Design a protein around this ligand. Structure first.
Ligand SMILES: COC1=C(OC)C(=O)C(C/C=C(\C)CC/C=C(\C)CC/C=C(\C)CC/C=C(/C)CC/C=C(\C)CC/C=C(\C)CC/C=C(\C)CC/C=C(/C)CCC=C(C)C)=C(C)C1=O
Ligand SMILES: CCCCCCCCCCCCCCCCCC(=O)OC[C@H](COP(=O)([O-])OCC[N+](C)(C)C)OC(=O)CCCCCCCCCCCCCCCCC
Ligand SMILES: CCCCCCCCCCCCCCCCCC(=O)OC[C@H](COP(=O)(O)OCCN)OC(=O)CCCCCCCCCCCCCCCCC
Ligand SMILES: CCCCCCCCCCCCCCCCCC(=O)OC[C@H](COP(=O)(O)OCCN)OC(=O)CCCCCCCCCCCCCCCCC
Ligand SMILES: CCCCCCCCCCCCCCCCCC(=O)OC[C@H](COP(=O)(O)OCCN)OC(=O)CCCCCCCCCCCCCCCCC
Ligand SMILES: COC1=C(OC)C(=O)C(CC=C(C)C)=C(C)C1=O
Ligand code: SF4
Lengths: 97, 92, 45, 104, 159, 314, 80, 157, 67
């Protein structure tokens, strides 16, 4: 289990480096952002499962339910952006300078 | 495993067919409704995920709380739907 | 304090606001139509 | 916590399930239910500053009921030993470790 | 079979590395759909059953699909994906690099399932997730509020 | 042995999958006052094999397009559809899965991608427009499709398809829950993109537009196998074939009869009805069916409790 | 109000039925001669071993053979 | 037998039988000879009976039946669609208006024949070529395919 | 008439019963003449493996009162 947890944790860091190093299209980011939620969901489920801690399984899912809406909001902002610029490049989001 | 055996035969059968196929014959996002629908879909999906444990939860000793909870979830989402049907939503 | 390439910035707008519908041609061969109708149609979705 | 509207109202919406020894469904105790209990009935009335130095036996154990790493080091070491000896044939696995048995 | 998990874990990192090189919006969606498949298997590998298929049922086809769905509508435009693939392979062996060192100095299956509770007819997951309705009925309410809030919140973002 | 049991359960279905197209091109025929294909072979029995060979031989033109999201899409479509027959519980199943119906629901859901991937891969306007609408109704229909099953399960007690053989030892689940059968049948018609609900790839030529020869065939095969599988799921979940533990084949014999008749029904539906409009289709699910399903979903959490009929787990 | 229900039953004949069920499911449980059984029938189903207590004495617990007339019974479940 | 030549012939035949039994046509439906084809598809003379599908898109179409005048504006399209079909493809010209120019041969907007824009394999004659005649023409395409010997030429090449 | 749609169906039916009869006899022949036991919950496996450990090396082999 410890080895698998290491992989999942680095997966989250590789997904961390991704969302903290943008490149053009935002939908990539939001997509990356989701890669973390999967890694968190997998790790939470894994330890809960090998701790036989059934009282906590509710969490693995609460994490997904909140993460899904979180993403819903994220995509509506994205659609709003390629309606105002139509190209969804993190590049044009600089009016606030 | 037993399942693996079946599945890899399943992929093999399909990859075999595509190969044979190749080897033998020798931008407007107008419909944010589209997007809207799709937003709904997950909100409903996620909701399903909350309802998916109900078969195990039926056997819960409480029962009263089970139903009280489940009925509240179904009702609040349906109201979400209702408001999708009040403004210009779900009317593509 | 405006420096070099910092004066480029000019004040933000006071109002806080800044300043073919995927036209497709209906097929002539299309089973729809009587065989020769090139209906150009600009369609928003 | 910051605003204890829960204790005041007497409600317990967030405390019943914070530790592995909390009520598990169908009374299926989790791994370590024994230890965590021994750790937290120890650190009850004794604040943290003093739940961290004298109640260290119970955490050092509960840190090994769940991580279960000191074990790994034991077993992993044992493993290597067998390997070396076996390579020179110094050690050989009995039928028990050869897949021969019928306990019932 | 042993270490079935580490292999998978390794595949999960590969998929995350693919999402991290930020490949084209939908080519990588596949990437997620791949590691989501992989994570579905791992949870299903530790005995997890419902939790495992939930992700496959919800994150896999529900979210992710909706994600690409939107990608087609917006951010479907194009301009080095093969270079990304090229460098992807670069780090794949590099994971082994890390793996080699770890193995270099410290064996799965020694333990994947920690206590089996062999005599038990009420031992799976989904009994725990169904505590949303007994003894953990606050997680259920707050999840419900989030969904109800989502319908109201999103309509303005579109409008 | 297990391998032999993989040939059976696959080939047999593939051979049957071929004979469905034939029984489609003849039942539609006589309904329309025409013999249908009888000249190749005896009574058209060799007809399905004939175009299969023509399809594979013709050039799989790769458009001036992706080359993977193009070849992954038919492989995925055939793989998921043939895969979903793995857990089906004819008499006793091949791989009995405790959470079986979630497997079937999840595997179906994955097929929507193949449509999305093929539409993006083609890189022509007809394909992308068709895929976006196609993906929309598939997942739209999935939402009622899933809730309709959750109502069923709660009266079955478990997710395992094997339990329903013991639930339906006295009466079909159509008698109770008929209101959902209809709604399962219509949703089964949408998810197999069959006629009443077959807007994609219509006379308007969606995700076969650029697909010819071998790729065309694989989805193609997939659709028809699905056509059967979904009908078969109707024939286990709602029409429960009589089960006798002493002789397991009368279960499969009646499963054979009910599956063929309900498979015949969507053939009969196709010839009989005009195709619905894209929004007409979603108007049905979100307005007409989803409120019916969500409410009848609650009735199926209440029917158990106050009728003291909570189903036995296991 | 009759019209609000007579045309809504002629046209829109789905939401009417839809709501009706929503309610009927919100009522039957409240009023029924069996609702109570569900929490019992499921409570009774014995899944986890029933651990026996020490007989300090003066107890009504069934001693020895569980068949002793003392204790809980499910004859309510029987002949239900 | 085993001498490969025989083996080859048999194989070719199978290949020919498959293409000749299932020909999926596409009907540009220029003009009227289209009405006489819809009649073939119709019940008196079922095309499907023979394995010809009533309709098909260009990607999945084995034979193109050009029914009707191929006017100069439609001439670039015909070609496109002919060029968008598979490697084993065929063209059955139908109608005097498409075999040659027909009543409109001397016009300024009519191509004098489709065989000036697409290679044509069977020419079905008649102003509204009778539906039976098209059926005869589709059947002669089937005899044309039967005779084709692609693999034996490969072997002898 | 309509007599002819039957040929095709016959070959469909026959190909939809094979699977159900096949899977249900390759089980009763690869499990010693007895249905393949269904291990749904830990306890069913235990007794299943306990039985394995009981005799021979296969579960279908069932030692009786005479043991
Ligand atoms: C434009 O492309 C087309 C369509 O899309 C609209 C069609 O669906 C149709 C109409 C569909 C039909 C029922 C006729 C075509 C039927 C087929 C392709 C059947 C294919 C048969 C098989 C691959 C059998 C599979 C056999 C095996 C692998 C058995 C192995 C053991 C046609 C003809 C078409 O041209
Ligand atoms: C098993 C292998 C799993 C590999 C997962 C990789 C995840 C990261 C993304 C890798 C693909 C993107 C990339 O960088 O390469 C570009 C390349 C681009 O390939 P392409 O040729 O299809 O795309 C361009 C097409 N043209 C240029 C013709 C328009 O990606 C691929 O070669 C295919 C990747 C397939 C990934 C594996 C799919 C397995 C089944 C999934 C269900
Ligand atoms: C969206 C829906 C919003 C409304 C949600 C209502 C949820 C109702 C839950 C009913 C639970 C009934 C069984 C309770 C079992 C228990 O012991 O829980 C502790 C506490 C009090 O419950 P109980 O012990 O039954 O008290 C009466 C005793 N005769 O039970 C509790 O008080 C904690 C659980 C309910 C707390 C609700 C507090 C928030 C109310 C809504 C706030 C706004 C929305 C927030 C989302
Ligand atoms: C192509 C991709 C889609 C393929 C079709 C969809 C496959 C869906 C698989 C769902 C997960 C498997 C599952 O739910 O059950 C597996 C079963 C464990 O469940 P259960 O039997 O209840 O265990 C306890 C009681 N016996 O028993 C097992 O755990 C068996 C081991 C897990 C097998 C999972 C499926 C393996 C598929 C292998 C090929 C995957 C190809 C992926 C391609 C995309 C790139 C990664
Ligand atoms: C689960 C709960 C049920 C399902 C909830 C989720 C879906 C809710 C949908 C609510 C929609 C309200 C609405 O605005 O619809 C109006 C209806 C259709 O109108 P429109 O959508 O414009 O379509 C016209 C073209 N066909 O046109 C109508 O006027 C329809 C009127 C329907 C109601 C008529 C009365 C029905 C019986 C009500 C019984 C009690 C209802 C519940 C009471 C709860 C409190 C006790
Ligand atoms: C008369 O106009 C025409 C059509 O629309 C009315 C067709 O659909 C078709 C297509 C019909 C068949 C036989 C596939 C043809 C041929 C045509 O020309
Ligand atoms: S040939 Fe006779 S029928 Fe065919 S198109 Fe020209 S005129 Fe119309």
């Amino acid at each position: 289990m410890p080895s698998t947890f290491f992989n999942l944790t680095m997966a989250f860091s590789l997904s961390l480096l991704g969302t903290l190093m943008f490149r053009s299209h935002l939908m990539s980011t939001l997509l990356c952002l989701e890669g973390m939620v999967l890694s968190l969901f997998i790790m939470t489920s894994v330890t809960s499962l090998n701790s036989n801690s059934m009282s906590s399984m509710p969490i693995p899912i609460t994490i997904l339910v909140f993460a899904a809406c979180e993403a819903a909001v994220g995509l509506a902002l994205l659609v709003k952006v390629s309606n105002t610029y139509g190209t969804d490049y993190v590049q044009n989001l600089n009016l606030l300078q | 495993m037993n399942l693996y055996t079946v599945i890899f035969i399943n992929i093999l059968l399909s990859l075999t067919l595509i190969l044979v196929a190749f080897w033998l014959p020798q931008r407007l996002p107008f419909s944010m409704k589209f997007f809207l629908v799709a937003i709904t879909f997950l909100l409903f999906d996620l909701e399903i995920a909350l309802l998916l444990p109900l078969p195990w939860a039926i056997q819960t000793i409480k029962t009263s709380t089970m139903m009280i909870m489940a009925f509240i979830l179904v009702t609040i989402l349906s109201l979400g739907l209702a408001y999708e049907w009040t403004q210009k939503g779900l009317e593509w | 304090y405006p420096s070099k390439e910092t004066a480029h910035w000019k004040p933000p707008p006071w109002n806080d606001v800044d300043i073919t519908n995927m036209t497709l041609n209906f097929g002539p061969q299309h089973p729809a139509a009587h065989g020769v109708l090139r209906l150009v149609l600009e369609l928003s979705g | 916590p910051f605003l204890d509207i829960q204790k005041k109202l007497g409600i317990s919406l967030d405390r019943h399930f914070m530790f592995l020894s909390a009520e598990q469904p169908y009374k299926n105790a989790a791994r370590c239910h024994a230890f965590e209990k021994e750790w937290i009935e120890c650190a009850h009335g004794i604040g943290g500053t003093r739940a961290k130095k004298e109640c260290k036996i119970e955490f050092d154990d509960f840190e090994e009921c769940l991580l279960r790493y000191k074990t790994m080091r034991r077993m992993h070491d044992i493993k290597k030993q067998r390997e070396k000896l076996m390579k020179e044939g110094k050690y050989t696995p009995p039928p028990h470790h050869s897949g021969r048995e019928e306990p019932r | 079979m042993n270490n079935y998990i580490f292999v998978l874990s390794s595949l999960f990192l590969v998929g995350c590395l693919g999402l991290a090189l930020k490949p084209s919006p939908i080519y990588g969606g596949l990437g997620l759909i791949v590691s989501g498949f992989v994570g579905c298997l791992m949870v299903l590998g530790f005995g997890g059953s419902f939790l495992g298929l939930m992700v496959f049922l919800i994150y896999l086809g529900g979210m992710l699909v909706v994600f690409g769905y939107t990608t087609a509508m917006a951010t479907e435009e194009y301009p080095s994906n093969w270079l990304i693939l090229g460098f992807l392979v670069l780090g794949v062996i590099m994971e082994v690099f890390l793996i080699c060192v770890l193995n270099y100095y410290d064996g799965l299956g020694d333990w994947l399932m920690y206590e089996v509770d062999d005599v038990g007819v009420m031992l799976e997951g989904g009994i725990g997730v169904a505590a949303m309705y007994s003894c953990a009925t606050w997680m259920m309410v707050v999840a419900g509020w989030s969904l109800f809030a989502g319908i109201f919140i999103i309509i303005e973002i579109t409008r | 042995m297990f391998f032999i049991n993989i040939l059976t359960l696959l080939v047999p279905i593939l051979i049957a999958m071929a004979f469905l197209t034939l029984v489609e091109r003849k039942i539609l025929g006589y309904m329309q006052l025409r013999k249908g294909p009888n000249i190749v072979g005896p009574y058209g029995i060799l007809q399905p094999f004939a175009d299969a060979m023509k399809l594979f031989m013709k050039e799989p033109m790769r458009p001036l397009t992706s080359m993977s999201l193009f070849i992954i899409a038919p492989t995925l479509s055939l793989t998921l559809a043939l895969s979903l027959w793995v857990p089906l519980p004819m008499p006793h199943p091949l791989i009995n899965l405790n959470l079986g119906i979630l497997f079937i629901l999840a595997t179906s859901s994955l097929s929507v991608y193949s449509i999305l991937w093929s539409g993006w891969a083609s890189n022509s306007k007809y394909s992308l427009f068709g895929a976006l609408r196609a993906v929309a109704q598939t997942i739209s229909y999935e939402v009622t499709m899933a809730i309709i099953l959750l109502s069923v399960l709660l009266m079955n007690g478990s997710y395992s398809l094997q339990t329903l053989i013991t639930t339906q030892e006295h009466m079909w689940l159509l008698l109770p829950a008929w209101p959902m059968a209809m709604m399962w049948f219509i949703s089964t018609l949408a998810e197999t993109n069959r006629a009443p609900f077959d807007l994609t790839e219509g006379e308007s030529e969606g995700f076969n537009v650029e697909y010819a020869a071998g790729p065309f065939a694989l989805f193609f095969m997939a659709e028809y196998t699905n056509i059967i599988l979904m009908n078969a799921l109707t024939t286990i979940i709602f029409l429960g074939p009589l089960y006798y533990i002493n002789l397991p084949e009368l279960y499969s014999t009646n499963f054979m009869m009910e599956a063929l008749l309900l498979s015949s029904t969507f053939l009969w539906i196709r010839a009989s009805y005009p195709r619905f409009r894209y929004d007409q289709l979603m108007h049905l699910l979100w307005k007409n069916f989803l409120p019916l399903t969500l409410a009848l979903c609650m009735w199926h959490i209440s029917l158990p409790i106050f009728t003291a009929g909570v189903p036995p787990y296991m | 109000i009759s019209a609000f229900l007579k045309n809504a039953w002629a046209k829109e004949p789905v939401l009417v039925v839809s709501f009706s069920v929503w309610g009927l499911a919100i009522i039957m449980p409240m009023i029924s001669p069996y609702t109570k059984y569900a929490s019992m029938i499921n409570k009774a189903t014995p899944y986890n071993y029933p651990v026996p207590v020490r007989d300090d004495g003066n107890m009504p617990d069934v001693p020895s053979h569980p068949q002793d007339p003392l204790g809980p019974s499910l004859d309510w479940l029987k002949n239900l | 037998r085993s001498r490969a030549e025989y083996v080859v012939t048999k194989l070719d035949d199978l290949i020919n039988w498959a293409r000749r039994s299932s020909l999926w046509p596409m009907t540009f439906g220029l003009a009227c000879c289209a009405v006489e084809m819809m009649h073939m598809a119709a019940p008196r003379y079922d095309m499907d009976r023979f394995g010809v599908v009533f309709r098909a898109s260009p990607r999945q179409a084995d034979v193109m039946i050009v029914a009707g005048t191929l006017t100069n504006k439609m001439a670039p399209a015909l070609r496109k669609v002919y060029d968008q079909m598979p490697e084993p493809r065929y063209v059955v010209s139908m109608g005097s208006c498409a075999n040659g120019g027909g009543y409109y041969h001397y016009s300024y907007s009519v191509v004098r024949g489709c065989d000036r824009i697409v290679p044509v394999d069977i020419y079905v004659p008649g102003c509204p070529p009778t539906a039976e005649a098209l059926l005869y023409g589709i059947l002669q395409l089937q005899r044309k395919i039967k005779r084709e010997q692609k693999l034996k030429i490969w072997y002898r090449r | 008439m309509w007599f002819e749609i039957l040929p095709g169906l016959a070959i469909m039916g026959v190909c939809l019963v094979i699977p159900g009869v096949s899977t249900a006899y390759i089980h009763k022949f690869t499990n010693g003449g007895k249905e393949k036991r269904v291990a749904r919950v830990q306890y069913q496996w235990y007794l299943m493996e306990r039985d394995r450990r009981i005799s021979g090396v296969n579960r279908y082999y069932v030692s009786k009162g005479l043991e």
